[PDB]
């Protein structure tokens, strides 16, 4: 499914980032990184869910999890 993050979606992210010319390898590389990121966050999100004896990962879990990772997020759980 990580192939679903398409070439032009990564391309756009790169634009908004200030990137003018994008190597061909980047795309694959990017996905690599994106995956690690998600994994990490989701491991933590899910750990929170498990500890709450719930089967639904909630917005707040994701938030707490992202906060642990040093990536605080404003707009959801708080």
């Amino acid at each position: 499914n990580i192939q679903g993050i398409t070439k032009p979606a990564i391309r756009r992210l790169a634009r908004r980032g200030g990137v003018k010319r994008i190597s061909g390898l980047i795309y694959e590389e990017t996905r690599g990184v994106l995956k690690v990121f998600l994994e990490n966050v989701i491991r933590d999100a899910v750990t929170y869910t498990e500890h709450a004896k719930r089967k639904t990962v909630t917005a707040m879990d994701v938030v707490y999890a992202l906060k642990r990772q040093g990536r605080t997020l404003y707009g959801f759980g708080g």
Binding site: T72, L73, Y74, G75, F76, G77, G78
Partner: protein, 92 residues
Amino acid sequence: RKESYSIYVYKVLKQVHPDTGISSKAMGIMNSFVNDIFERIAGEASRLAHYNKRSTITSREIQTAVRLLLPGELAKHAVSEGTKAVTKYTSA
């Protein structure tokens, strides 16, 4: 229930800009911001109480915690508003 600082964020909005309004998502962001800061300041004040073996958190701890977390000018002005409101409260 589900508490919130929406009411007060909206009050202060009226004060600074009475011409202006605020979307659901941005009020969300403001709650996040108020809770974030709250935890930072109270945490730091708690560590402060702790290092010095007192069991109570006073306006003093809150203050030096603000000194520690807030950058320069924001810190000055915030300490300002703080001690001001403390005295105006104390003078009943």
